[PDB]
Amino acid sequence: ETTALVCDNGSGLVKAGFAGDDAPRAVFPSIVGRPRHQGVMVGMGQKDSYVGDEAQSKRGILTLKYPIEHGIITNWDDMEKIWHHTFYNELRVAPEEHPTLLTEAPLNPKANREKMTQIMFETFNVPAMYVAIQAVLSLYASGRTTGIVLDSGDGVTHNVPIYEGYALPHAIMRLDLAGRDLTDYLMKILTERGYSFVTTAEREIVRDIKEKLCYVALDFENEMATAASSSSLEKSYELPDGQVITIGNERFRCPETLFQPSFIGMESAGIHETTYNSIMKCDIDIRKDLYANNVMSGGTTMYPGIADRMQKEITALAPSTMKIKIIAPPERKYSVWIGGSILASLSTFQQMWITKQEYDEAGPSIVHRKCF
Amino acid sequence: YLMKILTERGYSFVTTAEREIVRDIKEKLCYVALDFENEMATAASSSSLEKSYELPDGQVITIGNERFRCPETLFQPSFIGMESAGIHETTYNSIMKCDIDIRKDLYANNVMSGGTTMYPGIADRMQKEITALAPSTMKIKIIAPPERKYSVWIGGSILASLSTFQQMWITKQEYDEAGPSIVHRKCF
């Protein structure tokens, strides 16, 4: 009992490591694949189930399925399998030796929290644990006490206004739009270009393509016009088979779905509009502080130029008499994990944990009362 | 607030169509609680309060504490984060600001109207709260007509039917000669 482990069950990726380290010791995607063919060879009885980078490597003969969908778990067996894998094969640390820290998106069903707490306390018999929010850990990592969080993850995008020493639970907005919808739209448009991708392996391929050759556009109409003069914007990517794919307008089209949800058919508003509404719902005095500080985190906000576009949109919407500043740290991908580690390292938090005596006594209805 | 809590239960509703659906759900399966803590405790023994509703798609939603939670926001505005007081407190303050003699008459007569006051038991809760706040030496009566939804329209029709009101109207000639400001002085 010297340190604690912080695990972030990201909608598309899993981050884990020791409390105190500045970088995670285990970064693998949440994939639980199973064989799709029959199997003929006899010198192999291997691992009916596959997880982790192994699944990514041999994805061509597996039906990859994401255990977590838009922030809510759908298959508990897959999540338990990934937890076991991360705890034993990668970390090689017994659950009893150290406690575990878990994080989840806001406005999630209580059933998920109760089931997760019960499984953690019963199966792995962890000495203690806790449940927190990714946005607050982002604040802790950023070393600030006031601001607005843009936690645009792979599965969920949400904002949580905060003030010195207190939060505003009544001004929390959660949007289902996230990286998965962007990937689906990218596949749909790549179909309109002439390239077809259906199965999950090509889903990973398109995910990599978006990660490598996508960016946001300051002006949509101007970019479209310059695309009409398509002689300096098209770029080529090399597929594993060697085929070359040329991508033009699709580079700056899919990211615009964040600001224009109507493309996918969702009757909602963009991230700028949602943040403006959330800040407006707050008290007048704290609006200045919230404008002066705007923290963003998540893997969906690494597109170059996103900060500039958000600043321009907010200034256009907001009155043109004050200053709006956007802060874009270059390590926002692991901000949640860093915040969790710092929070665990805090001396005052050594008593806020939830122990097993606790659970020995009642169904995990205790996760909520406390530990929140 | 009902949408927000329905999210905490496990059911999500965002767009306006589901807004209408939740509005209907509240209209059909909501009521006020005489005692909040006692109702919460009885909800802890959730075996006689939960009710089911049929969605258009056929899905069934089970609603428990949310039935008597959202209406309590009227008496506890702090739930939404508004730094104000409940309807009982506002009515008490309004009546107190009046002259002493007319306080008795105001207490003896309390008319309520609108579509937000049809929740069963609201009148009893309001009576209990007012009597607790007001001195316990007189009688407080709550009148809850069963047609308060259209009370405003009925009153307007009766006022129009009044013979004396046939001359209080505002006609085009006087409006044009005077201007839009005339309505401001017309009965405030």
Binding site: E69, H70, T74 | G10, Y11, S12, F13, E18, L55, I61
Partner: peptide, 7 residues
Amino acid sequence: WXAXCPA
């Protein structure tokens, strides 16, 4: 989810 969205 159960109602609205899949999960």
